[PDB]
Design a protein around this ligand. Structure first.
Ligand SMILES: O=C(Cc1cccc(Cl)c1)Nn1cnc2ccccc21
Ligand SMILES: O=C(Cc1cccc(Cl)c1)Nn1cnc2ccccc21
Ligand SMILES: [Cl-]
Lengths: 298, 305
């Protein structure tokens, strides 16, 4: 029993964090094999023109107490790739993956190439993340673990005026309509990840919370007409198919659970909680629910 | 900006997890130097648990009855001893991944990270607190016994908890790394229940200071309170008594925000009376009590918004 916001063990990622300094700027880098990946804004804009003026010796890379020698540099979108002389012996099995909004991941927050904390979060439908970062956290990475392979999905770049965060995949492509410069940028209006709230309601049923269940069902069309009015993401047939295993384990059909969410949206909780929460939680995917209520190891 | 429930990076602890098997039971162990620490209930059967005599069960065991596995390598057990509710298995190989560590016994209200493991393999990490009734609201399944709770302030790992059992209400009970239980619990399948839980008042106050640091002041009022009047009100809402020590501990946050502890106490009194009225504090519709004053100073900025 128990349901917590759970992150993947960070050990394989901790052994990859380094400090990158260029002039007055200092941020974090990801050392995989003989390449250090970091936000290109460390050189700060006409980034190709700013990069051509730099030499390898201008970039100071530090792994623990050891200085890594930069022997080459190139840019890929909004990420700077620094070729180093030493390959990382702690390099894990990994891949670079781009995630979709609604998917969750773990963030290893770092300052000065040193990891300070780990937390779980989700890519919002508006492509921002509600993280916890201070100045110096740029270059911190987001990841998932699938068996023994680390899938790197996010690199932190900036904080928006509302306190939310923006960044890129490991190939330097931003999530959202953001750019890596000082200008007027704002997060778009956000929505609730419907498939995730449903998964979290199934997790509550698994943990013995059934007060919100009703005898009713709904059509997918009627549910979406209601959901759109509460700023909830449209629920697709794919989401319904993905919730199949949880539906079978609990004996509650997806559209049966949708009628429960419809009643919670129109009436509220009435002084009650679900899994210790007075709000409907949308940062656990159907896969996160299955993994936590089965004990999958890495 | 932002405020998340943040756990310590688990890497230094991951390199210490091993699998311990004794007969049919399999659980987790903590390998530090040449010793593996695990719950002593690994020697018990399901039947034994009603009224086990651990000393009598242990005397019948030999070193080779205990199977220890670190990754794909079988460790050799060369000694065994019991210290309270923990079994200490002397092994022939010292752990090369042993970090700088210490065993610390924590007080209720203190937070820590839990590295949940099954079969000597870590599966997840989360943050939680020692409740005033000495239980933890964890997320554990069968096979998680031996999972540990820790803090990593600076470069040293302070081990404070080892998982032993789940109570009928779904909450968890365990020991410090010297085998002494937190709470009036026993590693016995006897009728045991968690005492009535209370809210950790000093932690809710710290979390209200964190909200002020992040730019939120909607809940503040023009009133102050005496410590005694605050406690008379707090007790009626199942809140832990706030002591003078708690007030002294909140001094730095009070100075950084310019809001006196008893003025923050008056705002808490008002929040308990009125509720939130459709509003949230740091993305939460409930008053959060699992962030200590030290956690807030650690996570939050030194400059108030
Ligand atoms: O946002 C920036 C600087 C920046 C300015 C312009 C463009 C870009 Cl890409 C970055 N730094 N940053 C990142 N996370 C932070 C959290 C709290 C404060 C500052 C933080
Ligand atoms: O509770 C026990 C066994 C046990 C019974 C009686 C006393 C003692 Cl010390 C141990 N194992 N356990 C630990 N966390 C769990 C979570 C879900 C199911 C079982 C779980
Ligand atoms: Cl303590």
């Amino acid at each position: 029993s128990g349901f917590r916001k759970m992150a993947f063990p960070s050990g394989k990622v901790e052994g990859c964090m380094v400090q990158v300094t260029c002039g007055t700027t200092t941020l974090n880098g990801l050392w995989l094999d003989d390449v250090v990946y970091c936000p290109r804004h460390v050189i700060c804009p006409n980034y190709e023109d700013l990069l051509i003026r730099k030499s390898n010796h201008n970039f100071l890379v530090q792994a623990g107490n050891v200085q890594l020698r930069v022997i080459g540099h190139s840019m890929q979108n909004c990420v700077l790739k620094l070729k180093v002389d030493t390959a990382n012996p702690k390099t894990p099995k990994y891949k670079f993956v781009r995630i979709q909004p609604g998917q969750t991941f773990s963030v290893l927050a770092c300052y000065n190439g040193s990891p300070s904390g780990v937390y779980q979060c989700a890519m919002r439908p508006n492509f921002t993340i509600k993280g916890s970062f201070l100045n110096g956290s740029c270059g911190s990475v987001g990841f998932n673990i699938d068996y023994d392979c680390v899938s790197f999905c996010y690199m932190h770049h900036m904080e928006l005026p509302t306190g939310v965060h923006a960044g890129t995949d490991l190939e330097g492509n931003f999530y959202g309509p953001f750019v890596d410069r000082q200008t007027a940028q704002a997060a778009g209006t956000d929505t609730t990840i419907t498939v995730n709230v449903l998964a979290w309601l199934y997790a509550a049923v698994i943990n013995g919370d059934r007060w919100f269940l009703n005898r009713f069902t709904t059509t997918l069309n009627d549910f979406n007409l209601v959901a759109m009015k509460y700023n909830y993401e449209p629920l697709t047939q794919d989401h319904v198919d993905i919730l199949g295993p949880l539906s079978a384990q609990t004996g509650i059909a997806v559209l049966d659970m949708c009628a429960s969410l419809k009643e919670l949206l129109q009436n509220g909780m009435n002084g009650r909680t679900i899994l210790g929460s007075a709000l409907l939680e949308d940062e656990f995917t159907p896969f996160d629910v299955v993994r936590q209520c089965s004990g999958v190891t890495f």
